Amino acid sequence: GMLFDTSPKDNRKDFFDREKEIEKLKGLRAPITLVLGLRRTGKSSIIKIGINELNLPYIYLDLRKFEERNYISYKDFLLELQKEINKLVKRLPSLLKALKNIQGIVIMGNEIKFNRLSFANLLESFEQASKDNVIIVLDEAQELVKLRGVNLLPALAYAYDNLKRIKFIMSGSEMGLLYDYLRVEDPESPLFGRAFSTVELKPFSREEAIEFLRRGFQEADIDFKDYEVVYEKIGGIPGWLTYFGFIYLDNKNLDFAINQTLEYAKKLILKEFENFLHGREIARKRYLNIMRTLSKCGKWSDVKRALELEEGIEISDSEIYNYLTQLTKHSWIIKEGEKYCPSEPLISLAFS
Ligand SMILES: Nc1ncnc2c1ncn2[C@@H]1O[C@H](COP(=O)(O)OP(=O)(O)O)[C@@H](O)[C@H]1O
Ligand SMILES: [Mg+2]
Numbered sequence: 001g002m003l004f005d006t007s008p009k010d011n012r013k014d015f016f017d018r019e020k021e022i023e024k025l026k027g028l029r030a031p032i033t034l035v036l037g038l039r040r041t042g043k044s045s046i047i048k049i050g051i052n053e054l055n056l057p058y059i060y061l062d063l064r065k066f067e068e069r070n071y072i073s074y075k076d077f078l079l080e081l082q083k084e085i086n087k088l089v090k091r092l093p094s095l096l097k098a099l100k101n102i103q104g105i106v107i108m109g110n111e112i113k114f115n116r117l118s119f120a121n122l123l124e125s126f127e128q129a130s131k132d133n134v135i136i137v138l139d140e141a142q143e144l145v146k147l148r149g150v151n152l153l154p155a156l157a158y159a160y161d162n163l164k165r166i167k168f169i170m171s172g173s174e175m176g177l178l179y180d181y182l183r184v185e186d187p188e189s190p191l192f193g194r195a196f197s198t199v200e201l202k203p204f205s206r207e208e209a210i211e212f213l214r215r216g217f218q219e220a221d222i223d224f225k226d227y228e229v230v231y232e233k234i235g236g237i238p239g240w241l242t243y244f245g246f247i248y249l250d251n252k253n254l255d256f257a258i259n260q261t262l263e264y265a266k267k268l269i270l271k272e273f274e275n276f277l278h279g280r281e282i283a284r285k286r287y288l289n290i291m292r293t294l295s296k297c298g299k300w301s302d303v304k305r306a307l308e309l310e311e312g313i314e315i316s317d318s319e320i321y322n323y324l325t326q327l328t329k330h331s332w333i334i335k336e337g338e339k340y341c342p343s344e345p346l347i348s349l350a351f352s
């Protein structure tokens with residue numbers, strides 16, 4: 001690969017720095033490791049790099065495939081787990097034997113089929129089958145909020161307290177929703193009071209962004225001069241800088257590569273906003289209004305004024321609070337003081 005491959009990296013040789021973050025992740029320093037960061041900050045990348053370098057058995061649940069749904073069924077969750085387990089038995093010969101006595105499992109012949117299941121007994125059997133730590137990756141774990149008919153928390157707590165060879169890695173692009181999922185705020189919840197080893201990926205600063213591009217161009221062996229305009233136009237999100245780098249290498253026209261990145265970002269961001277608006281069709285026009293209003297940032301008064309201007313009616317403070325709270329939980333905006341801002345520059349652009 002190369003530094004500007006437009007897919008999550010799986011090798012450190014293709015990945016710019018984040019050395020402290022990868023090393024912390026790899027430390028598996030508590031039974032649960034949280035990987036945080038906005039979309040496109042490299043979370044799936046460091047997880048892949050981390051598990052490749054550790055050379056430990058693992059189950060990888062890519063939950064992004066549920067992002068366009070409002071609900072995940074027990075059946076659809078089990079089919080994903082089933083697929084991963086089948087990869088794991090190939091690495092853990094004695095697992096197929098250890099899964100034989102699980103109530104809802106059927107074996108035929110070097111594979112399993114589920115025919116509810118005890119997630120805690122399942123995890124315990126991975127641990128029985130392995131001399132080494134087994135990593136359970138829940139990539140975009142906050143998606144499990146949508147898995148309404150299953151509560152995995154007691155099983156996660158059981159593992160945390162009792163399964164010493166089970167190490168979870170849970171990532172989330174929507175920080176508040178991830179914490180809400182794990183019920184960190186609820187004293188009676190199974191994971192309350194338990195510490196998570198936490199790694200956060202922030203957007204590149206100006207100097208990091210410039211160094212990232214510099215490194216990828218030096219590696220392609222091509223000249224580049226305009227690093228500052230690229231940062232000014234694209235911003236610090238690694239994923240967008242990566243795409244730009246790829247396009248510029250492919251075409252060598254600065255304005256074309258910037259415009260193509262901007263147009264790709266806008267399309268992707270607005271599709272992701274549609275995922276957000278799924279199940280909120282009642283408040284849909286209002287959310288669009290809020291984001292346009294907050295594009296160049298604004299205060300509560302600006303949000304209120306713009307909503308009431310569009311609809312004519314007075315709008316309560318309860319409704320307003322709920323709309324901004326949802327946007328903040330899902331990482332669309334961030335509140336600085338009395339100022340709410342899109343969480344990165346191209347989200348401003350997308351609603352401009
Ligand atoms: N430090 C980095 N070095 C090289 N590429 C990166 C880096 N950070 C992110 N990327 C690239 O940016 C894109 C988004 O990364 P990804 O791991 O999917 O982010 P997340 O899972 O946080 O949304 C991918 O193309 C990835 O290869
Ligand atoms: Mg990801």
